[PDB]
Amino acid sequence: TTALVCDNGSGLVKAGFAGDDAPRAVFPSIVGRPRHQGVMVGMGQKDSYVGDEAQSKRGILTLKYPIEHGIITNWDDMEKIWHHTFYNELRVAPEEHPTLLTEAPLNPKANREKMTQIMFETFNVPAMYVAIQAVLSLYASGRTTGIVLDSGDGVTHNVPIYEGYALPHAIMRLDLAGRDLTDYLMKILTERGYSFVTTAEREIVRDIKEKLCYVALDFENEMATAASSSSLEKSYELPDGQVITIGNERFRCPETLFQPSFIGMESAGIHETTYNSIMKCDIDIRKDLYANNVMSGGTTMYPGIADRMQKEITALAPSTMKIKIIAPPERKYSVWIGGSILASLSTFQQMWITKQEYDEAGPSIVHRKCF
Amino acid sequence: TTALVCDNGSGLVKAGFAGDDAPRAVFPSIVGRPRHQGVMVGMGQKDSYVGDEAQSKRGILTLKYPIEHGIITNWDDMEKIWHHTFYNELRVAPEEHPTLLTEAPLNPKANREKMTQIMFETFNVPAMYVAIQAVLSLYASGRTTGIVLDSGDGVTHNVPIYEGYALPHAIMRLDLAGRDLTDYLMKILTERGYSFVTTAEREIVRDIKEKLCYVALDFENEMATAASSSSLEKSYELPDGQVITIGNERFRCPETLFQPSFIGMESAGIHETTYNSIMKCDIDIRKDLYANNVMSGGTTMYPGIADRMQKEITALAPSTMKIKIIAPPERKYSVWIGGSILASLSTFQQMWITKQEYDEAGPSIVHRK
Amino acid sequence: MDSQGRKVVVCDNGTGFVKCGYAGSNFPEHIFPALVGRPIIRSTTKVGNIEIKDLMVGDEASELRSMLEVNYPMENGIVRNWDDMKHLWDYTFGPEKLNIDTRNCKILLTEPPMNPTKNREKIVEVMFETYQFSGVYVAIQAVLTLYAQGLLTGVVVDSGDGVTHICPVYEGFSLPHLTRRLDIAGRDITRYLIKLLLLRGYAFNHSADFETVRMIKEKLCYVGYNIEQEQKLALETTVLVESYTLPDGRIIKVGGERFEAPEALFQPHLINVEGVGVAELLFNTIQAADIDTRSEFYKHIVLSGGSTMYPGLPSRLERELKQLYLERVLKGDVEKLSKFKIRIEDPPRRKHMVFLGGAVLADIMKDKDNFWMTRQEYQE
Ligand SMILES: Nc1ncnc2c1ncn2[C@@H]1O[C@H](COP(=O)(O)OP(=O)(O)O)[C@@H](O)[C@H]1O
Ligand SMILES: Nc1ncnc2c1ncn2[C@@H]1O[C@H](COP(=O)(O)OP(=O)(O)O)[C@@H](O)[C@H]1O
Ligand SMILES: Nc1ncnc2c1ncn2[C@@H]1O[C@H](COP(=O)(O)OP(=O)(O)O)[C@@H](O)[C@H]1O
Ligand SMILES: [Mg+2]
Ligand SMILES: [Mg+2]
Ligand SMILES: [Mg+2]
């Protein structure tokens, strides 16, 4: 048999088989329950809906995310999504396939201990592993040195890696990601009078965000430009043919990646957080990290985020040296690709956790193997 | 008339008149600025807050320390803390009191110069002097020989002194200190899923550090007992009434002093750097340094640190001779107390840099006294 | 008034009620409903010698409503018809009430928080381009109730007619990223009360009926303190069934509807608003604030506006905040809850604490410079 790769993203679950180039399942990590008690019979068929049917039916459904800020929050619903992945999306009996899962850095330790227990005691997998998402991005980039900015649905984190060694004290984490940018977009549109609020309707703001938002390369110049011309305004058609309009809200939304004070965070922005992590590595390493910024994860898809990042870091770093932002188009799937690579290598096959190890070590084994 | 002794710690400013035995004001070396727009008439709305005032209004302030690693990184804020100290804490006009300041060894000389410019040009002090913190500590302990281990909020340093002669070549400095232990405690608490990322919340993690942490006497036995019987866990109550519990974090945190690879810097721990400072001294002096190993500064207040220190040095040094870790109860103030003594001595009264001498020779006179 | 003899009026233009008087007053002059109406003939109602003008406003429109089509010029804090709002303002400053020579007055308005942008722009416009006021200001609902309470710290729970807002303020610093809007307010409880009285077999459908059911609400409705015991009381015994007399003299019986209707504030799904109720939505606001500010916010919950006046709302709101705190912060340490300090400031004057707050603020700042927007600074 061949291993599965299952990136338990905060936003989209991405799953498939090790060795393939792109995931054979992608679906939203949501669980939906009906708003209204009034089932009929036969129809009204389930207590809860998972993944794509919960997007499709969403007008009747309260949607909850089992993952918040990269930590599993509702294990019963998270188990439901894993069950859905293997038995409905992949149609695989997991008892005979090794499954590589993923995690964000600096999570609670109890998170991955509970995670590995379910794999061995509910899905009774032969083997599994729990790789750090940023490390996987370098596999998809085909390189062994660089600083990975991964910013997903729920967490932004930086792991610097040099010559194949991580530098665990320079890792930095910032709980801004695609969720908070959507809630901020959902806020700022009240200035127009476009209320939304409903958790179903947040999925529409999410789609508005993906299709119209961009990062200004000079925020204050674009703000003063939006005061002058309609040129930035783009309309959007809601599902009922109400056409909303959005202007400077297009770029104020992702700007709070760089000015977290917009949503009351005290943190520095993503550019300065990256720079601070380089200035936490040794002098000889820094020369290489500046050349090898690797962006990863969904929110790095905003138009212009590469240029804005490159502009900002070159203003903080010493001017005598090249800074380059590596940003392939497939950087949304980097983490799944990097998992599929890792699980294919012959040198990896020795380091699976296996049932025979879990049976003697208990759940704590994950703190011993997966480093 | 009385001298004015002012220890500008990286964490706590400690100031008071000479000729008495404890600081008259101790307050944190913090300035804060409003993070939000004020929207009501008749609030204070000061552009900054200092010390205990900023610490109380902490919920709506960004907090900055003007000193980092014993270097004054923002002079505009540092003069603000001195201004608060003289006029509001000591309630004294500095124009009438000669002032004794303190500084760490192996520190950029521009710091001492600029500090002295401020005193003579802004506060008009009639005379002033700058003393090495580790040498002051021996005065408080009442002796003329020993190796002094200061560890403050921002810096750790070793200074051996024998019969009142310093050995400048044996001075060793290590920027691991109470700040790095705080940031490291913040990091490891996330393993239990707490979060303390703001600058305000770091003050709560500092308060945890001061209240719960202790140094392991044998680190692997504490790890093994924590992971099995788990009787080591202690609770703590947050400002909002949430109760956290922490376990082996209580001793993994200060163990960084002995294993700084936890933070990732390759240096020796405080024990082995102390041993190296002795082993750099001449053979005859080594005997008396082992007998007078004097701890100082607040980071040495951890329970068990004096015990662990003796255990570690005795594993390194020849077994034929005694090692005694001197650790008074007052070791938080041994730096300030030393200044109160030195400024009171009748023999010291010629050593002040007088305003007339500064006017003739500028800030560079600090290098000559 | 001002030193220059200029009258300093203070004016809340709520979606329910205009509340408009002079600065420094302890009471509002001239409470009246924000209403406009126009004469119509009904074949089912008596016509008489009472003169009905071709348009009527405010109090008169609400009492003659039995022969009027009636409109609320403002909804959810947003102006729907600027023409009817002009008429309502023309009545407010008119000979009926505050008979002011507007061109010489200073006027303090208020605007709801996080309201639409062009709403405020057109409000400020008309004050300088039709009434020609000598000075304007647009105060914030949250800070005004804090002036009426004399406080500098608290979380306001302003529950007006159109919408309910939670707004933290700490030591006079605003916390605008913590503002929370709840869509349920007193207009929807009245729409909900109609829908329940329809289930007892009554009918209320005309524009004039909407005001009548509002008065039924204000007289009879109350927030249940412990919803299980209120349902038990209604099922076990008849005592809740209380009569009311419509203007047509038809007697209606009102029963458990008295507490079912206000309950939408705490179980929003009952009126198809998705979300969590005012108690939980408030709690989720405190738990978002910086950790040490939380213990002050719990000691200064400030209620404001008429939809808080339901008998028992502070008592109920205390209970849920305590249950939320025991559940989510103390993790069930029910003995430790006894140390929790919580205060709900429930002044009986709170129905007008926004206007009372403006009268304090305008009296403190009647003659200062940087406060009032002058018509000299306008039109640039
Ligand atoms: N084209 C796009 N432009 C900007 N943001 C996007 C785009 N597509 C997706 N996103 C954001 O990506 C986030 C998902 O990140 P992703 O890495 O796919 O999930 P996870 O981080 O859970 O693995 C979503 O919240 C969405 O808002
Ligand atoms: N009882 C204690 N246990 C552990 N650490 C402490 C204790 N008291 C103070 N500290 C820490 O020591 C530092 C303050 O000590 P201090 O000697 O005043 O530093 P400095 O003099 O350099 O400002 C802070 O980091 C504080 O958290
Ligand atoms: N005694 C009362 N008990 C409960 N609700 C009331 C009472 N009196 C008035 N109300 C409600 O409160 C509102 C009165 O207007 P107000 O509180 O001034 O709101 P606004 O200031 O937003 O216009 C109306 O929605 C009315 O239904
Ligand atoms: Mg991701
Ligand atoms: Mg010190
Ligand atoms: Mg109101």
From Swiss-Prot, chain A:
InterPro entries: Actin (IPR004000), Actin/actin-like_CS (IPR020902), Actin_CS (IPR004001), ATPase_NBD (IPR043129). One of its GO terms (molecular function) is hydrolase activity. Oxidation of Met-40 and Met-43 by MICALs (MICAL1, MICAL2 or MICAL3) to form methionine sulfoxide promotes actin filament depolymerization. MICAL1 and MICAL2 produce the (R)-S-oxide form. The (R)-S-oxide form is reverted by MSRB1 and MSRB2, which promotes actin repolymerization. The modification N6-methyllysine is found at residue 80. It catalyses: ATP + H2O = ADP + phosphate + H(+). GO terms for cellular component: actin cytoskeleton; actin filament; stress fiber; striated muscle thin filament. It is an enzyme of class 3 (hydrolase). SMART domains: ACTIN. The modification Tele-methylhistidine is found at residue 69. Its EC number is 3.6.4.-. In vertebrates 3 main groups of actin isoforms, alpha, beta and gamma have been identified. The alpha actins are found in muscle tissues and are a major constituent of the contractile apparatus. The beta and gamma actins coexist in most cell types as components of the cytoskeleton and as mediators of internal cell motility. Belongs to the actin family. Polymerization of globular actin (G-actin) leads to a structural filament (F-actin) in the form of a two-stranded helix. Each actin can bind to 4 others. This is Actin, alpha skeletal muscle. It comes from Gallus gallus (Chicken). The lineage of its organism: Eukaryota, Metazoa, Chordata, Craniata, Vertebrata. The gene is ACTA1.
From Swiss-Prot, chain B:
One of its GO terms (molecular function) is hydrolase activity. The modification Methionine (R)-sulfoxide is found at residues 40, 43. PROSITE patterns: ACTINS_1, ACTINS_2, ACTINS_ACT_LIKE. Keywords: Acetylation, ATP-binding, Cytoplasm, Cytoskeleton, Hydrolase, Methylation, Muscle protein, Nucleotide-binding, Oxidation. Signal peptide: none annotated. The modification N6-methyllysine is found at residue 80. Its main location: cytoplasm. One of its GO terms (biological process) is skeletal muscle thin filament assembly. It catalyses: ATP + H2O = ADP + phosphate + H(+). SUPFAM superfamilies: Actin-like ATPase domain. It comes from the Eukaryota. It is found in: Cytoplasm, Cytoskeleton. One of its GO terms (cellular component) is actin filament. It is an enzyme of class 3 (hydrolase). Its EC number is 3.6.4.-. Belongs to the actin family. In vertebrates 3 main groups of actin isoforms, alpha, beta and gamma have been identified. The alpha actins are found in muscle tissues and are a major constituent of the contractile apparatus. The beta and gamma actins coexist in most cell types as components of the cytoskeleton and as mediators of internal cell motility. Actins are highly conserved proteins that are involved in various types of cell motility and are ubiquitously expressed in all eukaryotic cells. Polymerization of globular actin (G-actin) leads to a structural filament (F-actin) in the form of a two-stranded helix. Each actin can bind to 4 others. This is Actin, alpha skeletal muscle. It comes from Gallus gallus. The lineage of its organism: Eukaryota, Metazoa, Chordata, Craniata, Vertebrata. The gene is ACTA1.
UniProtKB/Swiss-Prot annotation, chain C:
InterPro entries: Actin, Actin/actin-like_CS, ATPase_NBD. It comes from the Eukaryota. It is found in: Cytoplasm, Cytoskeleton; Cell projection; Nucleus. The lineage of its organism: Eukaryota, Metazoa, Chordata, Craniata, Vertebrata. One of its GO terms (cellular component) is nucleus. ATP-binding component of the Arp2/3 complex, a multiprotein complex that mediates actin polymerization upon stimulation by nucleation-promoting factor (NPF). The Arp2/3 complex mediates the formation of branched actin networks in the cytoplasm, providing the force for cell motility. Seems to contact the pointed end of the daughter actin filament. In podocytes, required for the formation of lamellipodia downstream of AVIL and PLCE1 regulation. Keywords: Acetylation, Actin-binding, ATP-binding, Cell projection, Cytoplasm, Cytoskeleton, Nucleotide-binding, Nucleus. This is Actin-related protein 2. Belongs to the actin family. ARP2 subfamily.
